Amino acid sequence: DSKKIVGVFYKANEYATKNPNFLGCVENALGIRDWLESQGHQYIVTDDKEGPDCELEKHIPDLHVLISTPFHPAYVTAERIKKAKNLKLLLTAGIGSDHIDLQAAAAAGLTVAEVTGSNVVSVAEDELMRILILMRNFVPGYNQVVKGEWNVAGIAYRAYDLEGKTIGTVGAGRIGKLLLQRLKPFGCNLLYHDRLQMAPELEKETGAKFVEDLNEMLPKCDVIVINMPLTEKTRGMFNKELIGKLKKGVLIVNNARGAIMERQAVVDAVESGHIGGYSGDVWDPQPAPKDHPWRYMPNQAMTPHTSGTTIDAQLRYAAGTKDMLERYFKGEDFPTENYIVKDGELAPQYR
Amino acid sequence: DSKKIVGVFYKANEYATKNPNFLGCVENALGIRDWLESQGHQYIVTDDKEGPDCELEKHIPDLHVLISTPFHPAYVTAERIKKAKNLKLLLTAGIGSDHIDLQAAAAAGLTVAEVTGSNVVSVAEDELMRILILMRNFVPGYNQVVKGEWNVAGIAYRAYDLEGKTIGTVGAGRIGKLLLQRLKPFGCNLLYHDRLQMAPELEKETGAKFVEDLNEMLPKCDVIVINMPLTEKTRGMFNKELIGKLKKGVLIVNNARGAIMERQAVVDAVESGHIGGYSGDVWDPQPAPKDHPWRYMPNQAMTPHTSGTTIDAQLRYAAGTKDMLERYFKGEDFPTENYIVKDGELAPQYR
């Protein structure tokens, strides 16, 4: 049976032509058009997703499948669900379903799925990158280059080797594990805190030492890497008090969630030098307003939120999306880990 | 017997007080003043090292030991040697003796030594950092932050994971080996070329595969890392021809020597997009003039030449220098590998 598939992505414009493997955009559309069309489906792709008059709303009433990414998400409200006669399947080409009303989706008997696990190497790499950028003081050196300067002292005074430094990951899920694996050869003192100890083999392999008490671990760290989710416990947890307990000059890397930091506490402690540097790609609010204080605070090595939308991640998101589409057409279950809602049943972690 | 020791270093000014372990400056002076003075030696430290009327020249006539770093080197000419009644020992607190007339030193019966091997981890780390910076496209992301922008597409289209990429090191001495060790966990296809194969053990451990023919290796690489000395053979070796044979979009990391690249060939190939990115801390000429085109060329991730003057490298330079001073005072030989000239005998590598 022919299905109407709608993909919502941002327009990449010239970037899409500069890189045809930039799949997460309108122009390249996950690389699935030829295949979908060959199978007799209709594939409608648009960036125009807000407003009653937008292209998306033209298709909401009769689409079967709506695909988007967290980067230009088509918001799936109860209101839009109610208008969607044929909608069965919501796919995130990526990870993140925060733009979907999951309860409404479940109530409507929908399936909601995402490409679980497909960003983890990307984020772990980006963390390691940021550890080195901060530790070795890349940013001031880069900024001298562009300004026509040459002032070694101005860079050297805050530049260290990573070797021998104490690096603590707060959380050691999949991303923190991959990070520790990549840190092992640098010859650091690796500490981790998590709800779960890694297997003793993995700890010997990475050399990471479990620290049950987080308030014991943090003051020992030259570098702290945030690798847990935003919960009531972790929200604003890096506040004035907690940042105060960290080593003076601590370097913090945060590709987890911006709101784990209390935003102004981080600015104050960066202006006072207590935080030596802060680098991440996650912000609050996100996208970060032009005025976001983390943009202009001293020693920042921020970027916009791109670590999980490398081309390689995008390829995995596209492949996962195609796999689930094929399964959907064939009446085959998706990988269990991909389901957020399955035929109207919200997975227990999302209840 | 009491000796007059002269150290020549740049003034770090406020940077020296901000970081008292910034040893490679006038203000902190290798951290050896108290020790030297306790031993009854005189320690004169100055940054004023050029011209007939400079502080250094006041002391050249009767100093026994002259210490400097490559960052603000006291040039040891035959002329100055001839004027130096008591000079016996030239130490570099660091690596690099290009500011010393070695043949004149040898003719004068001098000893010239440096702190061999003390920068290797620092440079290897910095290379690995730059691999990630380029591969993951940090710089354009950082630049958007500062400019108040938020354009994921503009960053994503040239951002990749390091995982899976073919990384070739041109040369695999100590620094290339350390780099390969650090690259292992990233899950890359590691290639190396060098005059010497690593032991099969170390190849198995790093997963790096030896490529005898450099012209076979280079076109396969997503990333090329320069890890050879500047010789008649390697000088300008990355010219238009060779750059042309590299994969379009190749990323090049160069903390070896600037002149291994033909300077304008790199600019042309970066402007054409054939080189996707170029990052290093070495330049020709060095210091890089305000006008240096590598500063302003697209996709550059340069810094001034600081990778080997991290605080940790400086501590090793200072410690090596102190060790040699103590040996000198006690009439003990230095580590063999530290000698460039030993009591007038130039090491055969330097003839």
Short mmCIF file of N, CA, C and O in Angstrom, two decimals, chain A residues 10 15 18-19 22 121-122 125-126 129 132-133 136 138-139 141-146 148-163 165 181-182 185 283 287-288 290 295-296 300-307 309-312 314 316, chain B residues 10 15 18-19 22 121-122 125-126 129 132-133 136 138-139 141-146 148-163 165 181-182 185 283 287-288 290 295-296 300-307 309-312 314 316:
data_model
loop_
_atom_site.label_atom_id
_atom_site.label_comp_id
_atom_site.label_asym_id
_atom_site.label_seq_id
_atom_site.Cartn_x
_atom_site.Cartn_y
_atom_site.Cartn_z
N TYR A 10 15.56 21.33 7.90
CA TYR A 10 15.89 22.70 7.49
C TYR A 10 16.45 22.70 6.10
O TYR A 10 16.84 21.67 5.57
N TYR A 15 24.93 24.65 1.27
CA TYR A 15 25.64 23.60 1.99
C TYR A 15 25.26 22.22 1.50
O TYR A 15 26.08 21.30 1.57
N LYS A 18 27.25 21.75 -1.66
CA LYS A 18 28.62 21.54 -1.27
C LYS A 18 28.91 20.15 -0.69
O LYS A 18 30.00 19.59 -0.89
N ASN A 19 27.94 19.58 0.03
CA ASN A 19 28.09 18.25 0.52
C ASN A 19 26.82 17.44 0.32
O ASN A 19 25.91 17.50 1.13
N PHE A 22 25.31 15.57 3.18
CA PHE A 22 24.59 16.29 4.23
C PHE A 22 23.10 15.92 4.13
O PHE A 22 22.30 16.64 3.55
N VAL A 121 29.25 7.95 19.56
CA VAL A 121 30.69 8.11 19.29
C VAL A 121 30.96 9.58 19.02
O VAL A 121 31.98 10.14 19.45
N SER A 122 30.06 10.20 18.27
CA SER A 122 30.19 11.60 17.87
C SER A 122 30.33 12.49 19.09
O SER A 122 31.21 13.32 19.16
N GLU A 125 33.72 11.78 21.05
CA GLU A 125 34.80 12.45 20.37
C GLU A 125 34.85 13.92 20.64
O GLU A 125 35.91 14.53 20.85
N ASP A 126 33.68 14.55 20.57
CA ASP A 126 33.61 15.98 20.68
C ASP A 126 34.01 16.39 22.10
O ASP A 126 34.68 17.42 22.29
N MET A 129 37.80 16.18 22.27
CA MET A 129 38.28 17.37 21.60
C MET A 129 38.31 18.58 22.47
O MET A 129 39.30 19.32 22.56
N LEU A 132 40.95 18.60 25.27
CA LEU A 132 42.24 19.06 24.74
C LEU A 132 42.25 20.55 24.41
O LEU A 132 43.19 21.25 24.75
N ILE A 133 41.18 21.06 23.78
CA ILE A 133 41.09 22.48 23.45
C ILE A 133 41.25 23.33 24.71
O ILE A 133 41.97 24.32 24.71
N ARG A 136 44.94 22.50 26.58
CA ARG A 136 46.09 22.97 25.79
C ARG A 136 45.90 24.41 25.32
O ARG A 136 46.80 24.97 24.72
N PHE A 138 43.92 26.09 23.11
CA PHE A 138 43.82 26.35 21.68
C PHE A 138 43.20 27.71 21.35
O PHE A 138 43.71 28.44 20.49
N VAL A 139 42.11 28.02 22.00
CA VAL A 139 41.31 29.16 21.59
C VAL A 139 42.06 30.50 21.60
O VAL A 139 42.03 31.19 20.62
N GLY A 141 45.22 30.92 21.33
CA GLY A 141 46.17 30.83 20.24
C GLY A 141 45.53 31.08 18.89
O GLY A 141 46.06 31.81 18.07
N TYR A 142 44.38 30.45 18.64
CA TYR A 142 43.66 30.67 17.40
C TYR A 142 43.29 32.16 17.27
O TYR A 142 43.46 32.79 16.21
N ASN A 143 42.81 32.74 18.36
CA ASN A 143 42.39 34.16 18.30
C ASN A 143 43.53 35.14 18.03
O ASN A 143 43.33 36.16 17.41
N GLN A 144 44.73 34.83 18.52
CA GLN A 144 45.91 35.62 18.14
C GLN A 144 46.20 35.56 16.65
O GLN A 144 46.61 36.56 16.05
N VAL A 145 46.02 34.38 16.05
CA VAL A 145 46.35 34.19 14.64
C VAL A 145 45.59 35.16 13.77
O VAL A 145 46.16 35.87 12.98
N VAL A 146 44.28 35.17 13.98
CA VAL A 146 43.36 35.93 13.17
C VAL A 146 43.57 37.45 13.40
O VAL A 146 43.39 38.26 12.50
N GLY A 148 46.47 38.90 14.01
CA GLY A 148 47.80 39.31 13.57
C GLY A 148 48.80 39.36 14.71
O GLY A 148 49.89 39.89 14.56
N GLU A 149 48.44 38.74 15.83
CA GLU A 149 49.26 38.76 17.02
C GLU A 149 50.25 37.60 17.05
O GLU A 149 50.12 36.62 16.30
N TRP A 150 51.23 37.72 17.94
CA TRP A 150 52.15 36.63 18.25
C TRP A 150 52.70 36.86 19.66
O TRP A 150 53.67 37.58 19.85
N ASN A 151 52.03 36.24 20.62
CA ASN A 151 52.29 36.43 22.04
C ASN A 151 52.22 35.09 22.76
O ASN A 151 51.19 34.70 23.30
N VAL A 152 53.34 34.37 22.72
CA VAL A 152 53.38 33.03 23.24
C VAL A 152 53.02 33.04 24.72
O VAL A 152 52.25 32.21 25.16
N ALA A 153 53.53 34.01 25.46
CA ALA A 153 53.35 34.00 26.93
C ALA A 153 51.88 34.04 27.28
O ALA A 153 51.42 33.34 28.21
N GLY A 154 51.14 34.81 26.49
CA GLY A 154 49.71 34.99 26.70
C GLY A 154 48.89 33.75 26.52
O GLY A 154 47.74 33.72 26.93
N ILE A 155 49.49 32.74 25.90
CA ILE A 155 48.88 31.44 25.63
C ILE A 155 49.47 30.40 26.56
O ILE A 155 48.74 29.64 27.15
N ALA A 156 50.81 30.39 26.65
CA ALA A 156 51.52 29.36 27.44
C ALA A 156 51.11 29.34 28.92
O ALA A 156 51.09 28.29 29.56
N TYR A 157 50.76 30.50 29.48
CA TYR A 157 50.54 30.59 30.92
C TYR A 157 49.33 29.79 31.38
O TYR A 157 49.22 29.46 32.60
N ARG A 158 48.45 29.44 30.43
CA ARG A 158 47.31 28.65 30.74
C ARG A 158 47.23 27.41 29.87
O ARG A 158 46.13 26.87 29.69
N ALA A 159 48.37 26.98 29.31
CA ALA A 159 48.40 25.82 28.46
C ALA A 159 49.14 24.70 29.20
O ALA A 159 50.24 24.93 29.72
N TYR A 160 48.51 23.53 29.24
CA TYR A 160 49.04 22.34 29.91
C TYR A 160 48.90 21.16 29.02
O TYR A 160 48.08 21.15 28.14
N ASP A 161 49.64 20.10 29.31
CA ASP A 161 49.40 18.85 28.65
C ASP A 161 48.28 18.15 29.37
O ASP A 161 48.11 18.30 30.60
N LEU A 162 47.56 17.30 28.64
CA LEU A 162 46.54 16.49 29.26
C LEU A 162 47.11 15.36 30.10
O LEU A 162 46.53 14.96 31.07
N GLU A 163 48.24 14.84 29.69
CA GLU A 163 48.94 13.79 30.42
C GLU A 163 49.03 14.15 31.90
O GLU A 163 49.34 15.29 32.25
N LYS A 165 46.76 14.60 34.16
CA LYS A 165 45.68 15.39 34.74
C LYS A 165 44.61 14.46 35.20
O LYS A 165 44.49 13.32 34.70
N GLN A 181 37.46 5.33 27.09
CA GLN A 181 38.22 4.49 26.21
C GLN A 181 39.17 5.35 25.41
O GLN A 181 40.34 4.99 25.21
N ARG A 182 38.70 6.50 24.94
CA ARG A 182 39.56 7.37 24.15
C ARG A 182 40.58 8.12 25.03
O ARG A 182 41.63 8.53 24.54
N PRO A 185 44.78 6.26 26.55
CA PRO A 185 46.18 6.39 26.13
C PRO A 185 46.85 7.69 26.48
O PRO A 185 48.05 7.79 26.31
N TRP A 283 23.20 24.43 25.40
CA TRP A 283 22.90 25.73 25.92
C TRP A 283 21.50 25.77 26.51
O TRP A 283 20.68 24.89 26.21
N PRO A 287 17.95 26.87 20.59
CA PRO A 287 19.14 27.62 20.20
C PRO A 287 19.46 28.81 21.12
O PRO A 287 18.58 29.43 21.67
N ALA A 288 20.75 29.06 21.30
CA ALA A 288 21.25 30.15 22.13
C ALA A 288 20.98 31.50 21.49
O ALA A 288 21.41 31.75 20.38
N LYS A 290 21.22 35.45 20.51
CA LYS A 290 22.39 36.25 20.11
C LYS A 290 23.11 36.82 21.33
O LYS A 290 24.32 37.04 21.32
N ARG A 295 28.33 32.96 25.30
CA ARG A 295 29.03 33.37 24.08
C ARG A 295 30.20 34.35 24.32
O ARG A 295 31.15 34.35 23.57
N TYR A 296 30.07 35.22 25.33
CA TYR A 296 31.00 36.36 25.49
C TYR A 296 31.78 36.30 26.80
O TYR A 296 32.56 37.20 27.10
N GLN A 300 35.67 30.96 27.10
CA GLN A 300 34.67 30.03 26.55
C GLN A 300 35.19 29.36 25.30
O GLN A 300 35.82 30.03 24.50
N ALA A 301 34.93 28.06 25.14
CA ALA A 301 35.18 27.37 23.90
C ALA A 301 33.93 26.69 23.39
O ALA A 301 33.94 25.50 23.07
N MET A 302 32.85 27.45 23.31
CA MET A 302 31.57 26.93 22.92
C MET A 302 31.45 26.78 21.42
O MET A 302 32.15 27.42 20.62
N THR A 303 30.50 25.96 21.05
CA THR A 303 29.97 25.97 19.70
C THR A 303 28.45 25.83 19.75
O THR A 303 27.90 25.41 20.73
N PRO A 304 27.78 26.12 18.63
CA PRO A 304 26.38 25.72 18.55
C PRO A 304 26.27 24.20 18.65
O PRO A 304 27.28 23.51 18.56
N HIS A 305 25.06 23.70 18.79
CA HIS A 305 24.81 22.30 19.13
C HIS A 305 24.92 21.42 17.89
O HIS A 305 23.92 21.09 17.26
N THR A 306 26.14 21.05 17.55
CA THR A 306 26.36 20.34 16.30
C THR A 306 27.01 18.96 16.46
O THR A 306 27.12 18.24 15.47
N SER A 307 27.45 18.59 17.67
CA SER A 307 28.30 17.38 17.80
C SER A 307 27.64 16.09 17.34
O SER A 307 28.32 15.14 16.93
N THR A 309 25.43 15.99 14.84
CA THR A 309 24.95 16.15 13.47
C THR A 309 26.13 16.29 12.51
O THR A 309 26.12 16.97 11.45
N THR A 310 27.21 15.59 12.89
CA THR A 310 28.27 15.39 11.95
C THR A 310 27.67 14.60 10.80
O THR A 310 26.62 13.96 10.95
N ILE A 311 28.37 14.60 9.67
CA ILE A 311 27.89 13.92 8.51
C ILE A 311 27.77 12.43 8.83
O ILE A 311 26.83 11.79 8.39
N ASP A 312 28.70 11.90 9.62
CA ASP A 312 28.69 10.48 9.94
C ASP A 312 27.51 10.08 10.81
O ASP A 312 26.90 9.01 10.61
N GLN A 314 24.69 11.80 10.77
CA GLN A 314 23.57 11.96 9.83
C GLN A 314 23.40 10.71 8.99
O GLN A 314 22.27 10.31 8.72
N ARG A 316 24.09 7.72 9.83
CA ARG A 316 23.51 6.72 10.68
C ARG A 316 22.03 7.00 10.94
O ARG A 316 21.23 6.06 10.88
N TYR B 10 62.19 35.40 27.78
CA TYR B 10 61.32 36.58 27.63
C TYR B 10 60.68 36.97 28.94
O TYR B 10 60.67 36.20 29.88
N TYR B 15 51.74 37.50 33.26
CA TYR B 15 51.50 36.09 33.07
C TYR B 15 52.31 35.27 34.05
O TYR B 15 51.86 34.20 34.48
N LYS B 18 50.35 35.49 37.32
CA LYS B 18 49.19 34.66 37.20
C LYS B 18 49.49 33.17 37.28
O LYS B 18 48.69 32.40 37.82
N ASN B 19 50.65 32.76 36.78
CA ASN B 19 51.05 31.40 36.88
C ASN B 19 52.53 31.28 37.26
O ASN B 19 53.42 31.34 36.41
N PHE B 22 54.85 29.07 35.40
CA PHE B 22 55.32 29.49 34.08
C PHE B 22 56.83 29.76 34.18
O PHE B 22 57.24 30.90 34.34
N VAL B 121 55.36 14.34 24.26
CA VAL B 121 53.95 14.06 24.56
C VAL B 121 53.17 15.29 24.19
O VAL B 121 52.07 15.19 23.64
N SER B 122 53.74 16.44 24.49
CA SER B 122 53.02 17.73 24.30
C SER B 122 52.67 17.89 22.83
O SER B 122 51.56 18.23 22.47
N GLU B 125 49.96 15.18 21.66
CA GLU B 125 48.65 15.62 22.09
C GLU B 125 48.08 16.73 21.21
O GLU B 125 46.89 16.76 20.86
N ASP B 126 48.93 17.71 20.90
CA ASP B 126 48.51 18.87 20.16
C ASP B 126 48.11 18.44 18.76
O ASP B 126 47.14 18.95 18.19
N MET B 129 44.67 16.81 19.03
CA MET B 129 43.73 17.91 19.18
C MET B 129 43.34 18.53 17.88
O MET B 129 42.15 18.75 17.58
N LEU B 132 41.12 16.39 15.55
CA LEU B 132 39.71 16.53 15.93
C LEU B 132 39.14 17.89 15.60
O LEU B 132 38.02 17.98 15.09
N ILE B 133 39.88 18.96 15.91
CA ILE B 133 39.43 20.33 15.57
C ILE B 133 39.06 20.42 14.08
O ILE B 133 38.00 20.94 13.72
N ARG B 136 36.13 17.57 13.06
CA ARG B 136 34.83 17.88 13.68
C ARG B 136 34.40 19.32 13.46
O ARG B 136 33.32 19.72 13.88
N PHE B 138 35.44 22.38 14.55
CA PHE B 138 35.31 23.23 15.72
C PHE B 138 35.35 24.70 15.38
O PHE B 138 34.53 25.49 15.88
N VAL B 139 36.32 25.10 14.58
CA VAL B 139 36.60 26.52 14.42
C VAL B 139 35.41 27.35 13.92
O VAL B 139 35.08 28.34 14.55
N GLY B 141 32.31 26.67 14.18
CA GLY B 141 31.39 26.67 15.32
C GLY B 141 31.78 27.68 16.37
O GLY B 141 30.95 28.43 16.82
N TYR B 142 33.05 27.69 16.78
CA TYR B 142 33.51 28.69 17.74
C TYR B 142 33.26 30.12 17.22
O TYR B 142 32.74 31.00 17.94
N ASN B 143 33.61 30.36 15.97
CA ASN B 143 33.44 31.70 15.39
C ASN B 143 31.99 32.21 15.32
O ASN B 143 31.76 33.41 15.39
N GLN B 144 31.03 31.31 15.16
CA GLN B 144 29.61 31.69 15.23
C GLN B 144 29.23 32.14 16.63
O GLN B 144 28.38 33.00 16.80
N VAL B 145 29.82 31.48 17.64
CA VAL B 145 29.47 31.79 19.04
C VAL B 145 29.75 33.25 19.32
O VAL B 145 28.88 33.98 19.74
N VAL B 146 30.98 33.64 19.03
CA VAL B 146 31.49 34.97 19.25
C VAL B 146 30.66 36.02 18.46
O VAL B 146 30.32 37.09 18.97
N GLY B 148 27.55 35.87 17.51
CA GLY B 148 26.12 35.91 17.86
C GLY B 148 25.28 35.08 16.91
O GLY B 148 24.05 35.14 16.93
N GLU B 149 25.95 34.28 16.10
CA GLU B 149 25.29 33.46 15.10
C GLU B 149 24.83 32.11 15.67
O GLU B 149 25.22 31.69 16.78
N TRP B 150 23.99 31.44 14.88
CA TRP B 150 23.53 30.09 15.16
C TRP B 150 23.04 29.50 13.85
O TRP B 150 21.89 29.69 13.46
N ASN B 151 23.97 28.83 13.17
CA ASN B 151 23.78 28.30 11.84
C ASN B 151 24.39 26.90 11.80
O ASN B 151 25.54 26.72 11.42
N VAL B 152 23.62 25.92 12.24
CA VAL B 152 24.11 24.56 12.34
C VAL B 152 24.56 24.08 10.97
O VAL B 152 25.60 23.46 10.87
N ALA B 153 23.80 24.39 9.93
CA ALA B 153 24.10 23.85 8.60
C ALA B 153 25.49 24.24 8.15
O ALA B 153 26.25 23.42 7.57
N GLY B 154 25.84 25.49 8.46
CA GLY B 154 27.13 26.06 8.12
C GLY B 154 28.31 25.38 8.73
O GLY B 154 29.41 25.59 8.27
N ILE B 155 28.08 24.62 9.79
CA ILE B 155 29.09 23.87 10.50
C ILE B 155 28.98 22.42 10.13
O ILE B 155 30.00 21.81 9.85
N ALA B 156 27.76 21.88 10.14
CA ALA B 156 27.54 20.43 9.92
C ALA B 156 28.07 19.94 8.56
O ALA B 156 28.56 18.83 8.43
N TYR B 157 28.01 20.79 7.54
CA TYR B 157 28.31 20.32 6.18
C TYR B 157 29.76 19.93 6.01
O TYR B 157 30.10 19.21 5.05
N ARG B 158 30.63 20.38 6.93
CA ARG B 158 32.03 20.01 6.89
C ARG B 158 32.49 19.35 8.18
O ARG B 158 33.68 19.36 8.48
N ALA B 159 31.54 18.84 8.98
CA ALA B 159 31.86 18.21 10.25
C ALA B 159 31.66 16.69 10.15
O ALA B 159 30.62 16.23 9.69
N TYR B 160 32.67 15.94 10.56
CA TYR B 160 32.67 14.50 10.49
C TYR B 160 33.15 13.96 11.78
O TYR B 160 33.84 14.64 12.49
N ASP B 161 32.90 12.69 12.03
CA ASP B 161 33.51 12.02 13.15
C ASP B 161 34.86 11.55 12.71
O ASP B 161 35.09 11.27 11.52
N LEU B 162 35.77 11.40 13.67
CA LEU B 162 37.08 10.87 13.37
C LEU B 162 37.06 9.38 13.12
O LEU B 162 37.84 8.83 12.36
N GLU B 163 36.15 8.70 13.80
CA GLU B 163 35.93 7.29 13.66
C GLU B 163 35.85 6.94 12.18
O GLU B 163 35.16 7.62 11.40
N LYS B 165 37.98 7.15 9.77
CA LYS B 165 38.74 7.93 8.82
C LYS B 165 40.12 7.37 8.70
O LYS B 165 40.62 6.69 9.62
N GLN B 181 49.40 5.93 19.31
CA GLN B 181 48.91 5.34 20.53
C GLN B 181 47.64 6.05 20.95
O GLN B 181 46.67 5.42 21.38
N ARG B 182 47.63 7.36 20.81
CA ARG B 182 46.45 8.11 21.24
C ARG B 182 45.30 7.97 20.24
O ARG B 182 44.14 8.10 20.62
N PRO B 185 42.19 4.23 20.04
CA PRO B 185 40.83 3.97 20.48
C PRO B 185 39.79 4.66 19.68
O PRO B 185 38.64 4.36 19.88
N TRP B 283 55.44 27.69 11.39
CA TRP B 283 55.28 28.68 10.36
C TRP B 283 56.60 28.96 9.71
O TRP B 283 57.65 28.69 10.31
N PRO B 287 58.93 33.71 14.29
CA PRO B 287 57.53 34.10 14.39
C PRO B 287 56.90 34.50 13.05
O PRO B 287 57.58 35.03 12.18
N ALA B 288 55.62 34.19 12.91
CA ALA B 288 54.84 34.52 11.73
C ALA B 288 54.54 36.00 11.74
O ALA B 288 53.97 36.51 12.69
N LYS B 290 52.75 39.58 11.01
CA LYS B 290 51.36 39.98 11.07
C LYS B 290 50.65 39.65 9.75
O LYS B 290 49.45 39.36 9.73
N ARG B 295 47.54 32.89 8.34
CA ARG B 295 46.64 33.50 9.33
C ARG B 295 45.21 33.75 8.81
O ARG B 295 44.26 33.68 9.56
N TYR B 296 45.10 34.05 7.52
CA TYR B 296 43.86 34.61 6.95
C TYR B 296 43.22 33.75 5.89
O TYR B 296 42.17 34.10 5.34
N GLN B 300 41.65 27.71 8.17
CA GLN B 300 42.86 27.55 8.99
C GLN B 300 42.51 27.35 10.47
O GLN B 300 41.58 27.98 10.97
N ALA B 301 43.24 26.48 11.16
CA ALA B 301 43.11 26.35 12.59
C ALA B 301 44.48 26.45 13.24
O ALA B 301 44.87 25.58 14.04
N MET B 302 45.20 27.51 12.88
CA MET B 302 46.55 27.70 13.30
C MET B 302 46.60 28.24 14.73
O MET B 302 45.64 28.83 15.23
N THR B 303 47.76 28.09 15.32
CA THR B 303 48.12 28.86 16.50
C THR B 303 49.56 29.30 16.40
O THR B 303 50.30 28.77 15.63
N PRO B 304 49.97 30.26 17.24
CA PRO B 304 51.39 30.50 17.35
C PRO B 304 52.09 29.25 17.87
O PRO B 304 51.42 28.31 18.33
N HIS B 305 53.41 29.24 17.81
CA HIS B 305 54.19 28.05 18.10
C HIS B 305 54.30 27.79 19.60
O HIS B 305 55.32 28.13 20.23
N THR B 306 53.27 27.19 20.18
CA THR B 306 53.21 27.04 21.63
C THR B 306 53.11 25.58 22.11
O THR B 306 53.19 25.35 23.32
N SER B 307 52.99 24.59 21.22
CA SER B 307 52.68 23.21 21.70
C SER B 307 53.71 22.61 22.62
O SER B 307 53.39 21.76 23.46
N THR B 309 55.56 24.38 24.75
CA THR B 309 55.84 25.28 25.87
C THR B 309 54.62 25.37 26.76
O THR B 309 54.28 26.38 27.44
N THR B 310 53.90 24.25 26.78
CA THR B 310 52.93 24.06 27.82
C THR B 310 53.65 24.10 29.16
O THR B 310 54.82 23.87 29.26
N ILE B 311 52.89 24.38 30.23
CA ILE B 311 53.49 24.49 31.53
C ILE B 311 54.19 23.14 31.88
O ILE B 311 55.25 23.12 32.48
N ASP B 312 53.58 22.04 31.46
CA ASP B 312 54.16 20.73 31.78
C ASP B 312 55.47 20.49 31.04
O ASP B 312 56.41 19.90 31.62
N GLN B 314 57.41 22.96 30.11
CA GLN B 314 58.34 23.90 30.80
C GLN B 314 58.88 23.31 32.08
O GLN B 314 60.04 23.54 32.40
N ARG B 316 59.42 20.19 32.67
CA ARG B 316 60.40 19.22 32.28
C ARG B 316 61.68 19.91 31.79
O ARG B 316 62.78 19.44 32.15
#
